[PDB]
């Protein structure tokens, strides 16, 4: 399956959001970050990646595609914006095994506080 996962800063909070934040997938889903608006990216938070999966990180305004297989919990950010909160999760599965390790990955305050709601906003 996909999904979209649309990057905005417009009448948003803090310089932008993703939109959805939180997303629940299968091995083998592929999520589309999209730039619907300008200045946004998509990478891997260090400390957030199951064993087992590749970091990524995209240019900044382009259409961009990964597909998840490992499965676990996995903490993305927009790079200029990972200060100011702007993250996101994506869990591949049920039950995560890194459900642990990642709620105690470090992060900025505004961006810890949207990756708590979010993992919550996953079940978890
Ligand atoms: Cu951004």
């Known amino acids: 399956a996909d999904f979209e996962v649309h990057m905005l800063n417009k ?50 305004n382009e259409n961009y595609k990964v597909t998840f297989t ?8 927009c790079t200029p914006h990972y200060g100011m909160g702007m993250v996101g999760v994506v869990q591949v599965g049920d039950a995560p ?9 470090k992060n900025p305050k505004k961006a810890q506080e949207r990756l708590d709601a979010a993992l919550a906003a996953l079940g978890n």
């Open 97 to 105: 095994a890194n459900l642990e390790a990642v709620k105690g990955a």
């Open 70 to 77: 490992a499965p676990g919990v996995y903490g993305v950010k």
């Open 11 to 60: 009448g948003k909070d803090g310089a932008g959001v993703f939109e959805p934040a939180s997303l629940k997938v299968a091995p083998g889903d592929t999520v589309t970050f999209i730039p619907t608006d300008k200045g946004h990216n998509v990478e891997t938070i260090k400390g957030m990646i199951p064993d087992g999966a590749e970091a990524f990180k995209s240019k900044i």
